[PDB]
Design an enzyme around this catalytic site. Structure first.
Site, PDB file in Angstrom:
ATOM      1  CD  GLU A 138       5.251  -5.800  -3.198  1.00 49.50           C
ATOM      2  OE1 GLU A 138       4.845  -5.275  -3.942  1.00 49.50           O
ATOM      3  OE2 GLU A 138       5.626  -6.944  -2.908  1.00 49.50           O
ATOM      4  CD  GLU A 227       3.103  -9.489   0.295  1.00 55.29           C
ATOM      5  OE1 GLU A 227       2.987  -8.526   0.766  1.00 55.29           O
ATOM      6  OE2 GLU A 227       2.698  -9.687  -0.962  1.00 55.29           O
TER       7      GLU A 227
END
Length: 395
Positions: A138, A227
């Site tokens: 991320e 994820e």
């Protein structure tokens, strides 16, 4: 209305389904857990993908091994995701009036790459060949890890990804924001250094699940959902019905509107995850099993009427001279659904059913009469069907 399943219309080739392990953050899985996660027996999840984190501090790397090993022994693949480069590689810079935001230093790009490689090597030396490794987790939601802008990542792809002796996941956007990965598809050179496009789906709406750019430029490339947790991370939620149906339809969508070849959930053990803290499989976990245990790595998704009736949602896969169907009903009302098998033929059909008062409970075998069968999808349930294709190829 009719679910028609085209055995001939192949979509994406599945890599697997799985979860994350993080011993420092959530405590390792235990021997017994290890195999609830990777066994595919009765009351195991059959997860075939493990994710682990590349720790900035290389003297912790060893934490990863025992559980990786287990996974690798069960035939699961394992990839790794870095949160932060080694602290001495990192500078504090100004992200919108933010004295504090961190980033890789522009000129540590190659050190960073070495560090990645070292990890890949260290795992290898401990009997674990990583399938893949990610540039950054991320990079576009790094409040509390390492920020990378689209252009930063683009260089590392262009100039560094090439080094890493393992398939390269990028760019692991927290929410599948395409600005963070277009730069790569559109750069035949960065594109060379990528092996898997990877994203999370935190707060990504179904409409954003498709990705024309990739469909256009990403042939030979993989698409992984590395994820998410869903629909929430409410401590102690993993057994709520009908809530956990959502986990199911979420994967449904990942697979169908998204053409993801892999779907990786957050923490495997966790009051809100597929396997509860007592070692036990959650309803959420059951919703996960309905794919993970029957849609084996290497299976291939195929076209199949996705939304044949209100709250009914459908997906099909083929492999092993089988077609696996996943039929979810989210009404308070059970429904008779008819299944047509086009361009293939079946002898017989087996099924399992998770409802409010039942997990992965074997259902009643059926025989394929026409080239079709009927089946009742109970109120708020997920049924999975393994159809057995016909044989005369001596198998």
């Amino acid at each position: 209305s009719d679910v028609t399943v085209n055995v001939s219309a192949e979509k994406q080739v599945i890599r697997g389904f799985g979860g994350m392990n993080h011993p420092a953050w959530a405590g390792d899985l235990t021997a017994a857990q290890r195999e609830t996660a990777f066994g595919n027996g009765q009351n195991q999840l059959g997860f075939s993908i493990l994710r682990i984190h590349v720790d900035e501090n290389r003297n912790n790397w060893y934490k990863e091994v025992e559980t990786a090993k287990s996974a690798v022994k069960h035939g699961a693949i394992v990839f790794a995701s870095p949160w932060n480069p080694p602290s001495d590689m990192v500078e504090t810079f100004n992200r919108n009036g933010d004295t504090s935001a961190k980033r890789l230093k522009y000129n540590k790009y190659a050190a960073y790459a070495q560090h990645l490689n070292d990890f890949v090597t260290f795992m290898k030396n401990n009997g674990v060949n990583l399938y893949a490794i990610s540039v950054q987790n991320e990079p576009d939601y790094a409040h509390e890890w390492t920020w990378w802008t689209p252009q930063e990542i683009l260089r590392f792809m262009r100039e560094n990804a090439g080094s890493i002796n393992a398939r390269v996941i990028a760019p692991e956007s927290f929410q599948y924001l395409k600005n963070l990965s277009d730069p790569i598809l559109n750069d035949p050179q960065a594109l060379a250094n990528m092996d898997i496009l990877g994203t999370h789906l935190y707060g990504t709406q179904v409409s954003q699940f498709p990705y024309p750019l990739f469909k256009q430029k990403g042939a030979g490339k993989d698409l992984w959902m590395t994820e998410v947790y869903y629909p929430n991370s409410d401590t102690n939620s993993a057994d709520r019905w009908p809530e956990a149906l959502d986990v199911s339809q979420h994967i449904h969508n990942a697979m169908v509107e998204g053409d993801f070849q892999a779907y990786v959930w957050w923490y495997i053990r966790r009051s809100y995850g597929p396997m509860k803290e007592d070692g036990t499989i959650s309803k959420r976990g059951y919703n996960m099993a309905h794919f993970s245990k029957f849609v084996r790595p290497g299976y291939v998704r195929i076209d199949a009427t996705k939304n044949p009736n209100a709250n009914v949602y459908v997906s099909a896969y083929k492999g092993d001279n089988k077609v696996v169907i996943v039929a979810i009903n989210k009404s308070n009302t059970g429904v008779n659904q008819n299944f047509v098998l086009q361009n293939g033929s079946a002898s017989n059909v087996s099924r399992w059913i998770t409802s409010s008062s039942s997990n992965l409970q074997p259902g009643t075998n059926l025989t394929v009469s026409g080239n079709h069968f009927w089946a009742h999808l109970p109120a708020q349930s997920v049924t999975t069907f393994v159809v057995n294709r016909l044989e005369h190829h001596h198998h």
